[PDB]
Design an enzyme around this catalytic site. Structure first.
Site, mmCIF file in Angstrom:
data_model
loop_
_atom_site.group_PDB
_atom_site.id
_atom_site.type_symbol
_atom_site.label_atom_id
_atom_site.label_comp_id
_atom_site.label_asym_id
_atom_site.label_seq_id
_atom_site.Cartn_x
_atom_site.Cartn_y
_atom_site.Cartn_z
ATOM 1 N N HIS A 145 17.457 115.060 24.111
ATOM 2 C CA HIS A 145 18.101 114.709 25.359
ATOM 3 C C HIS A 145 19.099 115.831 25.731
ATOM 4 O O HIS A 145 19.042 116.387 26.803
ATOM 5 C CB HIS A 145 18.791 113.341 25.232
ATOM 6 C CG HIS A 145 19.325 112.783 26.528
ATOM 7 N ND1 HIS A 145 19.827 111.498 26.612
ATOM 8 C CD2 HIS A 145 19.412 113.301 27.780
ATOM 9 C CE1 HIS A 145 20.213 111.261 27.858
ATOM 10 N NE2 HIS A 145 19.948 112.333 28.592
ATOM 11 N N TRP B 277 26.396 117.140 24.219
ATOM 12 C CA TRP B 277 27.434 116.702 25.123
ATOM 13 C C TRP B 277 28.782 116.810 24.471
ATOM 14 O O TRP B 277 28.974 116.286 23.351
ATOM 15 C CB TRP B 277 27.258 115.212 25.530
ATOM 16 C CG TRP B 277 25.919 114.810 26.023
ATOM 17 C CD1 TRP B 277 24.942 115.616 26.579
ATOM 18 C CD2 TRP B 277 25.412 113.488 26.063
ATOM 19 N NE1 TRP B 277 23.822 114.860 26.888
ATOM 20 C CE2 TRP B 277 24.099 113.545 26.615
ATOM 21 C CE3 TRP B 277 25.915 112.255 25.660
ATOM 22 C CZ2 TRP B 277 23.285 112.404 26.759
ATOM 23 C CZ3 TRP B 277 25.102 111.105 25.824
ATOM 24 C CH2 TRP B 277 23.800 111.198 26.360
ATOM 25 N N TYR C 208 34.636 111.476 28.692
ATOM 26 C CA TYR C 208 34.084 112.820 28.760
ATOM 27 C C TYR C 208 34.296 113.361 30.134
ATOM 28 O O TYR C 208 34.576 112.588 31.045
ATOM 29 C CB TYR C 208 32.593 112.786 28.433
ATOM 30 C CG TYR C 208 31.766 111.858 29.336
ATOM 31 C CD1 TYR C 208 31.067 112.372 30.446
ATOM 32 C CD2 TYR C 208 31.678 110.477 29.068
ATOM 33 C CE1 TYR C 208 30.285 111.546 31.268
ATOM 34 C CE2 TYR C 208 30.916 109.632 29.884
ATOM 35 C CZ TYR C 208 30.228 110.176 30.988
ATOM 36 O OH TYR C 208 29.445 109.376 31.805
ATOM 37 N N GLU D 53 21.159 119.004 32.247
ATOM 38 C CA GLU D 53 21.913 119.082 31.025
ATOM 39 C C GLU D 53 22.929 120.242 30.972
ATOM 40 O O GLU D 53 24.084 120.030 30.593
ATOM 41 C CB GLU D 53 20.991 119.113 29.830
ATOM 42 C CG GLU D 53 20.267 117.716 29.634
ATOM 43 C CD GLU D 53 21.212 116.532 29.459
ATOM 44 O OE1 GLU D 53 22.174 116.707 28.693
ATOM 45 O OE2 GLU D 53 20.986 115.444 30.064
ATOM 46 N N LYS E 184 25.689 119.609 33.943
ATOM 47 C CA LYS E 184 26.573 118.463 33.672
ATOM 48 C C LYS E 184 27.413 118.648 32.439
ATOM 49 O O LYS E 184 28.616 118.377 32.434
ATOM 50 C CB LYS E 184 25.730 117.173 33.482
ATOM 51 C CG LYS E 184 26.567 115.920 33.225
ATOM 52 C CD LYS E 184 25.788 114.611 33.453
ATOM 53 C CE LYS E 184 26.736 113.401 33.363
ATOM 54 N NZ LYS E 184 25.995 112.122 33.260
ATOM 55 N N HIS E 185 26.767 119.042 31.356
ATOM 56 C CA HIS E 185 27.397 119.067 30.041
ATOM 57 C C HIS E 185 27.688 120.464 29.410
ATOM 58 O O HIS E 185 28.757 120.662 28.835
ATOM 59 C CB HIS E 185 26.521 118.287 29.059
ATOM 60 C CG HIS E 185 26.475 116.803 29.318
ATOM 61 N ND1 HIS E 185 27.596 115.986 29.226
ATOM 62 C CD2 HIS E 185 25.438 115.989 29.630
ATOM 63 C CE1 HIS E 185 27.233 114.732 29.463
ATOM 64 N NE2 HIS E 185 25.933 114.712 29.735
HETATM 65 C C1 D3Z Z 1 19.678 111.814 31.307
HETATM 66 C C2 D3Z Z 1 18.791 111.234 32.403
HETATM 67 O O1 D3Z Z 1 17.603 110.607 31.883
HETATM 68 C C3 D3Z Z 1 16.431 111.042 32.596
HETATM 69 N N1 D3Z Z 1 15.448 111.559 31.678
HETATM 70 C C4 D3Z Z 1 15.286 110.967 30.505
HETATM 71 C C5 D3Z Z 1 14.351 111.482 29.618
HETATM 72 C C6 D3Z Z 1 13.604 112.583 29.944
HETATM 73 O O2 D3Z Z 1 12.766 113.000 29.119
HETATM 74 N N2 D3Z Z 1 13.787 113.154 31.135
HETATM 75 C C7 D3Z Z 1 14.679 112.692 32.007
HETATM 76 O O3 D3Z Z 1 14.809 113.273 33.105
HETATM 77 C C8 D3Z Z 1 16.829 112.213 33.471
HETATM 78 O O4 D3Z Z 1 16.357 112.002 34.815
HETATM 79 C C9 D3Z Z 1 18.334 112.347 33.329
HETATM 80 O O5 D3Z Z 1 18.673 113.598 32.753
#
Ligand code: D3Z
Ligand SMILES: *[C@@H]1O[C@H](CO)[C@@H](O[C@@H]2O[C@H](CO)[C@@H](O)[C@H](O)[C@H]2NC(C)=O)[C@H](O)[C@H]1NC(C)=O
Ligand code: NAG
Length: 238
Positions: free
Chosen positions: A51, A54, A62, A111, A114-115
């Protein structure tokens, strides 16, 4: 490349020190987060996927979107320009967007923007001979490096917890199994629709978030699962 810090640098959150290139603050709790994507399925049938990474404040709050001047809509191009071809291939496999390969770019943008922009020790001013967006590629590399050390599927498997259409599982067993690859600190365990879904492994850091020492730390959130009946759905099940 990035600045190096002493291996006996003071631990983030667990010490009282000023934010610098060698001290992660206020984001001193670093979360390596993972997914179990079963519907739709992605990744290997026998691995969790990335994922992100963070920076949390030490109290569990956060920051997000911390530097608009370093937000990008071209991660794939940044990685290619830096010749990080094996990393990009690996990200396609192990950091997929569930919806498909064509959404990977948006997810990686998300990602980083944001983080990644909130990790104070990653800034260009922490580099020698910095080149444009060097820290973006290093960040993706670092997430991958840490993820490789946190093979959730195998830690679960070794404790007899494997995906099943019929078997269900106890939270404490899941927590213990994963705590075993994280110095006895369990991750946050996240469930969706009663199914095992997400993991956050918490760390404090000695030195820089890039190349520093990641020390397994206590979760600042426990779980949203029930104590039992937890499903571990098989990927690509049919
Ligand atoms: C964290 C959130 O979950 C969604 N999300 C979750 C899993 C993944 O494989 N891709 C994704 O895009 C995203 O739209 C967003 O970044
Ligand atoms: C990815 O996008 C960024 C942001 O637009 C690009 O960096 C900019 O490049 C332009 C055009 O060369 C420069 O004028 C800007 O000063 C750059 N901005 C920053 C903040 O560095 C970057 O070159 C793109 N990378 C790739 C490989 O396409
Ligand atoms: C990638 O390789 C190209 C071509 O050799 C080179 O111009 C560039 O400096 C390289 N970038 C990095 C960060 O390795």
């Amino acid at each position: 490349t990035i600045d190096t810090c002493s291996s006996d640098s003071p631990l983030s959150c667990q010490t009282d020190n000023e934010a610098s290139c060698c001290f992660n603050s206020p984001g001193g709790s670093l979360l390596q987060t993972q997914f179990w994507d079963y519907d739709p399925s992605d990744g290997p049938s026998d691995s969790w996927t990335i994922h992100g990474l963070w920076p949390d404040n030490c109290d569990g709050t956060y920051q997000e979107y911390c530097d608009e001047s370093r937000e990008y809509s071209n991660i794939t191009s940044i990685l290619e320009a830096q010749n990080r071809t094996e990393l990009l291939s690996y990200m396609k496999e192990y950091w997929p967007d569930y919806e498909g390969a064509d959404e990977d770019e948006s997810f990686w943008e998300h990602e980083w923007n944001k983080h990644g922009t909130c990790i104070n020790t990653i800034e260009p001013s922490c580099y020698t001979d910095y080149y444009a967006q060097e820290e973006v590629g290093d960040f993706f590399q670092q997430v991958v490096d840490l993820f490789k050390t946190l093979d959730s599927y195998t830690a679960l498997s070794d404790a007899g917890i494997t995906p099943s259409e019929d078997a269900t599982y106890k939270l404490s067993d899941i927590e213990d199994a994963l705590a075993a690859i994280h110095d006895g600190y369990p991750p946050y365990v996240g469930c969706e629709d009663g199914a095992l879904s997400q993991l956050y492994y918490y760390f404090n850091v000695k030195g820089s978030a890039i190349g520093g020492t990641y020390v397994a730390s206590e979760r600042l959130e426990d779980s949203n699962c029930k104590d039992s009946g937890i499903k571990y759905p098989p990927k690509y099940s049919s």
